[PDB]
Every structure is written in structure tokens, then in C-alpha cells.
């Protein structure tokens, strides 16, 4: 990473040009060029590159990814004093606190809403159960009721959670990672409803973000499900839209997972002070947030002074009504496993590769299996290393062999062990493999 410049990654659905405007203000005032990039799959690319000391100085994503980044040592602990922390809502700081340390700056609170075309649909449905018949009526006029991104489970989650699906059970401030709610009766009921819509040709399994956005913005579908960022392109399209509460399912509110868009500093950045100056003094100001927001709306921002303005917008009132019916995501490392497993279940059930029951059963099994193996691997390395530091060689090596046994490609692990273990002990270990 280059000293004396800032490189920023943010997702391509957000106001990256507006963020670049903040970057030009920063460059005007300071030495310092700010390059804003929006790589594809940045939330996967970041841990790959930052593990080698490469990547952006600053990473923007929802807070759910950040505990895993911090666990891997990829993020700098951030350094705001009390006066600065008091400028943002306390719950936003909670979202970026991990093992007692703040690991990112909160920017804005994101929740999905139902977005509808008021000319096609002056009174939108209050329930999921109403959607099939509405679709049939719209299909007779060459329209459809609903299109949204089925390829990312973020957009189907509110329906899965409605009647009781959950990721990891909340226990008095902590998440219980042994208590997974992906294959429960409520999760199965909501996904079954979505998959029946598809079976009966009221929705297409292949619909993705850009298909749905184009359909809505061209006046072809009466409804979509999307976040605040999407409102700019609908403005440009001139569709007469409303933003409202998500439909209920079996009388229960849909429960979106709420994201706090957050900015982390790469642990390998040589520009940590410049990143702090940019984030605290340029971005997290009314003017900085306004520049980004004008490009693509942020949602409900973390910065009190600017949020006090935005709450007057009826679209933000709707976003907050949906947020309050949902739950703030965990930031724990296990979120990555959850999302990969549920993504697979949704796609497989929607496509007919699996039944809903089998898809979610398998997702639950995959999450719990991944977490059990990780737990065992880490515990056995620790225990083996601890026993070696005490001179019980035989028992120490036996535990290290158990960890290696549950690692399919142990070359990197063996390189790490070769750096810490005395050579005679590493040699002993090699003979057990």
C-alpha cells in the first residue's frame, strides 16, 4: 500500500462518485490524492489481499463482515475520542464493536423496504399471500407484480425471518453460535411461500439485481424490494414510486437484517492518520454525508446532526419502520458461513435443485459442521502448542496431528508451525502425518 495517498473500496451500488467528491475536497486541503474504487466482490477480495499487506487503506461494507476481518487481524483499531463518539448514535458504535474494540466507523443504517409504482399500484398489498392474485391481474396487462434480487439472500431473508427464521440466537447481548435458526419451522414456511410463487410463474428464479432494477425503473413490474441506495436511479427514471412497509407473512412482519454501512482501516495501511483525518473530519460531517447521499441515498445516517434533517423524508420514515421490525445483523465471524449456506439454500430451492426442506436442512447442517470443525481445529492447535511449551512432546504432537487431520490442504499451516516449533519437534510432527 502506498504511503501518502488513500485508496478506498466501496460497493458499486453506493455513492462512490459522491465519496470521490469528498476525496477531492480532502486533496484540495491536504496533500493527498484519494482514489475511490468499486471492485466486484470487494467483501471477498479484501480478506484475500489484506492478508498479504495489500488492498485499500479504507474498506466500506455493512458491519456484518467486520468481525471476521478483525478476527483475521485485518483491521486497525480505531481511535475516536469521546467527543467524536458523541456525534454518532450509540447503537451504531455497538455495531462496529468487536471483542471490546471499535474496529470501524459507522456511516449509515440500511434496511430493505417495499418500493412500489403508484401509477400501476395505488394501494400495494399488505401481505405476501396477496401477491399471486395481484400478479395474475397485472400479467393480463403485460406487467408483473414483483421483481427483486433472488441471487442474494439478503433480499429473501426478511420473508424467511418473518415467521421465525434466525441466524444465531441472541442471548442477553451475545449470540449463541450453537443455536442456529435456518431450518426451523418459520424459515421453512417463508421459503416455501417464495418457492411456490416461482413454481406458479409469479416470479422467475433467475431474477438478479440488474434485471429487477431495470424492470421496476422501466415500469414493467409494480413492486421491488431494495434499499435506499436504489432511490436515485428510480428518481432518474421518473416512475412515481412509494417506499413502504414490507408485506407480512402469516400475519407477522417481515424482519429484514439491518446493516450499518461502516468504514474500516486496513491493518497494513501506512496512512492510518490520513484515513482518520478523512473519515472523522471530511466524511462524517454534514457536508461529507450530503455529498455521498446526493449521489446515492445512504439511509438513516449515524451522524446525529445530519440524521435530524433526513428523518423528515417519508422514505426514511419507511426505512426506519422496516428496520424496527427487523434486527441489526451480528458482526461475528460466523456470519460469513451463515450467508454462504443460506445463499446456496435459496438458489437451490428457487431453481428446483432441492426441495425447500432439503435445502434448508442442508444449510443448517453445513453451518453447524463448518463451525464445529473450525472450533476443533483451533482448540487442538492451542492445546498442542501449550503442551509443547511444557515439554510433553508426545501429547503436544498428538493434538497438532488432530488439527492437521481436519485440514485438507495443510501446507500453509505446516509453514506457520515450522516458524514457532523447535526444529526437532517439527521433525517429530512431520513423521506423524
Amino acid at each position: 500500500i502506498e504511503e501518502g495517498k488513500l485508496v478506498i473500496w466501496i460497493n458499486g451500488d453506493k455513492g462512490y462518485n459522491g465519496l470521490a467528491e469528498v476525496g477531492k475536497k480532502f486533496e484540495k486541503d491536504t496533500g493527498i490524492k484519494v482514489t475511490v474504487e468499486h471492485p466486484d466482490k470487494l467483501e471477498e477480495k479484501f480478506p484475500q489481499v489484506a492478508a498479504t499487506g495489500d488492498g485499500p487503506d479504507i474498506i466500506f461494507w455493512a458491519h456484518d463482515r467486520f468481525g471476521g476481518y478483525a478476527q483475521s487481524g485485518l483491521l486497525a483499531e480505531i481511535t475516536p475520542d469521546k467527543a467524536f463518539q458523541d456525534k454518532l448514535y450509540p447503537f451504531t458504535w455497538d455495531a462496529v464493536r468487536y471483542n471490546g474494540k471499535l474496529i470501524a466507523y459507522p456511516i449509515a443504517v440500511e434496511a430493505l423496504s417495499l418500493i412500489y409504482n403508484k401509477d400501476l399500484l395505488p394501494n400495494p398489498p399488505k401481505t405476501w399471500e396477496e401477491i399471486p392474485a395481484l400478479d395474475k391481474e397485472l400479467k393480463a396487462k403485460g406487467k408483473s407484480a414483483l421483481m427483486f434480487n433472488l441471487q442474494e439472500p439478503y433480499f429473501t431473508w426478511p420473508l424467511i425471518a418473518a415467521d421465525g427464521g434466525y441466524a444465531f440466537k441472541y442471548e442477553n447481548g451475545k449470540y449463541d453460535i450453537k443455536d442456529v435458526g435456518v431450518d426451523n419451522a418459520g424459515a421453512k414456511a417463508g421459503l416455501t411461500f417464495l418457492v411456490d410463487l416461482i413454481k406458479n410463474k409469479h416470479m422467475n428464479a433467475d431474477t438478479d439485481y440488474s434485471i429487477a432494477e431495470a424492470a421496476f425503473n422501466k415500469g414493467e413490474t409494480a413492486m421491488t424490494i431494495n434499499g435506499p441506495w436504489a432511490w436515485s436511479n428510480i428518481d432518474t427514471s421518473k416512475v412515481n414510486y412509494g417506499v413502504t412497509v414490507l408485506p407480512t407473512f402469516k400475519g407477522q412482519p417481515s424482519k429484514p437484517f439491518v446493516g450499518v454501512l461502516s468504514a474500516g482501516i486496513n491493518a497494513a495501511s501506512p496512512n492510518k492518520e490520513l484515513a482518520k483525518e478523512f473519515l472523522e473530519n471530511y466524511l462524517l460531517t454534514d457536508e461529507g454525508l450530503e455529498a455521498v447521499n446526493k449521489d446515492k441515498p445512504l439511509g438513516a445516517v449515524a451522524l446525529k446532526s445530519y440524521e435530524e434533517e433526513l428523518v423528515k423524508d417519508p422514505r426514511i420514515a419507511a426505512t426506519m419502520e422496516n428496520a424496527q421490525k427487523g434486527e441489526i445483523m451480528p458482526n461475528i465471524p460466523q456470519m460469513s458461513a451463515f450467508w454462504y449456506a443460506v445463499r446456496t439454500a435459496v438458489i437451490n430451492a428457487a431453481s428446483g435443485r432441492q426441495t425447500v426442506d432439503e435445502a434448508l436442512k442442508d444449510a443448517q447442517t453445513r453451518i453447524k459442521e463448518a463451525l464445529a470443525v473450525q472450533k476443533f481445529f483451533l482448540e487442538e492447535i492451542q492445546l498442542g502448542e501449550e503442551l509443547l511449551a511444557q515439554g510433553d512432546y508426545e501429547k503436544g504432537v498428538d493434538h497438532l496431528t488432530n488439527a492437521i487431520a481436519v485440514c485438507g490442504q495443510p501446507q500453509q499451516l505446516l509453514q506457520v508451525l515450522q516458524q514457532t516449533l523447535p526444529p526437532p519437534v517439527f521433525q517429530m510432527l512431520l513423521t506423524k502425518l
Partner: peptide, 12 residues
């Protein structure tokens, strides 16, 4: 951090 970087969803 060093041991956590050896793991992914896909495996080790």
C-alpha cells in the same frame, strides 16, 4: 489472527 487466516468456509 495467524491461525484464523488459515480457515475459510471452503476449508483449510
Amino acid at each position: 489472527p495467524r491461525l484464523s487466516r488459515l480457515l475459510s468456509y471452503a476449508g483449510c
